[PDB]
Design a protein around this ligand. Structure first.
Ligand code: ZN
Lengths: 588, 198, 50
């Protein structure tokens, strides 16, 4: 008989075991998530450890199956996932050392003190609000100067062992390791090798850039009301001033930078509080919304088995909006949901992940995942964005006919989004590209911070208010470094969200800028999306993006058609000062 | 009728005879086949169908005459931690015949690897347990299935009916149908005594 | 006789009430006349003279 028969039977003997043992781990973890106490810990641990030891054994057995003879592809794709050695390719001493480096630098970032203040809330809530150059500069500098002190020496040794596992896993760098997931291979036309992810991302970053250059120049010109003595009209923006301690979001500057601030944003939480919707009503409205999209109803056990409301002090449990899939058809949500429109839209956000985890559940275990790391998050938000629009909120009835939308309201709306989104894509590509340079080694370990504060000016337009050196690291002082995360997800999530938006709005026959697009009652837009959710990682994302959008490669023009009137008024308002920014200034 | 009217089954199918037309029929014998499967498997069992049930556990003839019942048994044979006392064959070297049964546990093999008395690389035990837990979704919940097979033979019938009796009436001219005897007339009481078997 | 009625057929005691529900069926079916099909399933035109 064939190896394909041999591989089929092995993977069948995997799948039926994997779905059971993974469930047992996942149920214990839900119980711990439901009851953050001991014994729940140990039961969660033991089951997850034994699941890992099963998964490592199966991966070790999968090595004896010669991949090239399989023509089924789907068997091949499960093998191509299972056979990945990961960290176990390292020498055990290097595996143990990197494991220690990971655990330690993660713990420092989880525990670092600025003197004293912890990172959360102490520094975050200062930098969102201080508006004092002296406090902000201290709170910025000391984070590098007291905790960056500790993360940088460990990051220098993390990079090499990560590159060593990348090399031994036949990646070109440990950036390519994360780039590996976007790879499409072995397909005519749809193929998309690991390095192809450097292209298009830089091609679209250079394309979104003008909208951010006009935002930065408007924000700078507007924020000089707040920081007249501290900001140059021509220079970059000082990294301490910008509403965050890293500056990765300007969203806190919104309250100062609204051009038409005498026109409040749209909200209907007051009518929902008036009508005393009880969170369970909100998930009921979320179901009726999905039903209005044509997505199926909640399953019976979900309603009691999930946690849809704050348990109170009588049941100790950390809680945040969290789609839960356990397998065996066990779907749940955990959220301490409360009576707001943002709990409502985050209920929609998590329910999108519930739908994606359900639709590809028809696939085998390893293929029960999104077609790429960013597609899962894009799907999450697109059912939030579709429901956020005032047109839908009028269909919700909670929006009065009084104070319908207008340009003055919607520019205020889009501005905060831009300070939340198009301000972050520079920072996202910045770190991911600088990480590509570190893991490739374009810059030795002493150049890292010097190249950083060059590219921060080219990419983000942000500058060191006081200089820092090899005793410091602004990158390693942030989660996605200190916790070893693929960060490009944020960049790709954003573009897929608006790419899917334009495709769904075209199906909805939307009119004008995409801010007033609504997908409810346009059932075809939901079914056109659902047929992509059904595939997940079983089929290339370069095909699923063709199925939804038709774009066989990444496109950013739909985002510019979402921000379209904001970009118009940025250009119109920018001539309040210099347009864009220059690299050649910092406060000192 | 008490089955047809029970209104307590999630599926009811009949083959070779329509389900309404069953009490008005007789058979040589009947046989009832019963087992437990997942709800996700319930869709596998029909004449012509295929699946782990139809291939390796229980198989119908494509000319089946009879009926099929299922209902969700979750509330009496699922349990916390799961019920693993219910087993299905995952592999067999060949598919079953209609109404074949084989419990044999001889190791299954894929590729060229003589298993020589142990499981291993592509040598596997051919049976799996479900693990029915009350947290499971309904497709992963258990169902009790019954299949009724109807026999017709050169031998006489033994299962029938039941027939319906009706009220007696007297002195009027009527049509009468007594124990399969037919006629018309007036009925009246009589003095003569038969023997007890006439 | 000809009868072009399209009302729902009821296969069992469950009153259909027009709902086309359980045991409730449409009384017509359409023929599978594909040209690549067996001759018993191929169409035949029939004419009757009286
Ligand atoms: Zn998400």
């Amino acid at each position: 008989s064939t190896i394909e028969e041999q591989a089929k039977t092995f993977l069948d003997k995997f799948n039926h075991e994997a779905e059971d043992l993974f469930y047992q781990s996942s149920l214990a973890s839900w119980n711990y998530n439901t009851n953050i106490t001991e014994e729940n810990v140990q039961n969660m641990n033991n089951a997850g450890d034994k699941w890992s030891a099963f998964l490592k054994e199966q991966s070790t057995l999968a090595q004896m199956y010669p991949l090239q003879e399989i023509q089924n592809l789907t068997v091949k794709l499960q093998l191509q996932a299972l056979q990945q050695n990961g960290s176990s390719v390292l020498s055990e001493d290097k595996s143990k050392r990197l494991n220690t480096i990971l655990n330690t630098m993660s713990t420092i970032y989880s525990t670092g003190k600025v003197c004293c203040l912890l990172l959360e809330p102490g520094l975050n809530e200062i930098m969102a609000n201080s508006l004092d150059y002296n406090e902000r500069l201290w709170a910025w500098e000391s984070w590098r100067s007291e905790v960056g002190k500790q993360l940088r020496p460990l990051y220098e040794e993390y990079v090499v062992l990560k590159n060593e596992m990348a090399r031994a896993n036949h990646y070109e760098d440990y950036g390519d390791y994360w780039r590996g997931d976007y790879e499409v291979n072995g397909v005519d036309g749809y193929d998309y090798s690991r390095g192809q992810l450097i292209e298009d991302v830089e091609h679209t970053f250079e394309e979104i850039k003008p909208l951010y250059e006009h935002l930065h120049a408007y924000v700078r010109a507007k924020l000089m009301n707040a920081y007249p003595s501290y900001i140059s009209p021509i220079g970059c923006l000082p990294a301490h001033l910008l509403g965050d301690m890293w500056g990765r979001f300007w969203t806190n500057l919104y309250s100062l930078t609204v051009p038409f601030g005498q026109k409040p944003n749209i909200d209907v939480t007051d009518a929902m509080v008036d009508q005393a919707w009880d969170a369970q009503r909100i998930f009921k409205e979320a179901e009726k919304f999905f039903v209005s999209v044509g997505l199926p109803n909640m399953t019976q056990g979900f309603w009691e088995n999930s946690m849809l409301t704050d348990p109170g002090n009588v049941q100790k449990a950390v809680c945040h909006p969290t789609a839960w899939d356990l397998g065996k058809g066990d779907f749940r949500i955990l959220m301490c949901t409360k009576v707001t429109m943002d709990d409502f839209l985050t209920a929609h956000h998590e329910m999108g992940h519930i739908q994606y985890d359900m639709a590809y559940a028809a696939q085998p275990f390893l293929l029960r995942n999104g077609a790429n790391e960013g597609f899962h998050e894009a799907v999450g938000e697109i059912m939030s964005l579709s429901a956020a629009t005032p047109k839908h909120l009028k269909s919700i009835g909670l929006l009065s006919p009084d104070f319908q939308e207008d340009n003055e309201t919607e520019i205020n709306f889009l501005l905060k989004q831009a300070l939340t989104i198009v301000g972050t894509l520079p920072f996202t590509y910045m770190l991911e590209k600088w990480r590509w340079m570190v893991f490739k080694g374009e810059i030795p370990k002493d150049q890292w911070m010097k190249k950083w504060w060059e590219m921060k000016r080219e990419i983000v337009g942000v500058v060191e208010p006081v200089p820092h050196d090899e005793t410091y690291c602004d990158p390693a002082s942030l989660f996605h470094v200190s916790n070893d995360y693929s960060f490009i997800r944020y960049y790709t999530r954003t573009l897929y969200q608006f790419q899917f938006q334009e495709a769904l709005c075209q199906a909805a026959k939307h009119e004008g800028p995409l801010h007033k697009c609504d997908i409810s009652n346009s059932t075809e837009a939901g079914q056109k999306l659902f047929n992509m959710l059904r595939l997940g990682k079983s089929e290339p994302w370069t095909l699923a993006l063709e199925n939804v959008v038709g774009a066989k490669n990444m496109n950013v023009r739909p985002l510019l058609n979402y921000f379209e009137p904001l970009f118009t008024w940025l250009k119109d308002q920018n001539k309040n000062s210099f347009v864009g920014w220059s690299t050649d200034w910092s406060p000192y | 009728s008490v089955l047809y009217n029970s209104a307590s089954f999630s599926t009811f199918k009949c083959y070779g005879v329509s389900p309404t037309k069953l009490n008005d029929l007789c058979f040589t014998n009947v046989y009832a086949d019963s087992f437990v499967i997942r709800g996700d498997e319930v869709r596998q069992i029909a004449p012509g169908q295929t699946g782990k049930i139809a291939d390796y556990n229980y198989k119908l003839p494509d000319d089946f005459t009879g009926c099929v019942i299922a209902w969700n048994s979750n509330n009496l044979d699922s349990k916390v931690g799961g019920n693993y006392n219910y087993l299905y064959r995952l592999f067999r070297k060949s598919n079953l015949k209609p109404f074949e049964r084989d419990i044999s546990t001889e190791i299954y093999q894929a590729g060229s690897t003589p298993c020589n008395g142990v499981e291993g690389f592509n040598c596997y035990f051919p049976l799996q347990s479900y693990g029915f837990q009350p947290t499971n979704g309904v497709g992963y919940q258990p169902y009790r299935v019954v299949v009724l097979s109807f026999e017709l033979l050169h031998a006489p019938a033994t299962v029938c009916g039941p027939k319906k009796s009706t009220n007696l009436v007297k002195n009027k001219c009527v049509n009468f149908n007594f124990n399969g005897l037919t006629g018309t007339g007036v009925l009246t009481e009589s003095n003569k005594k038969f023997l007890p078997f006439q």
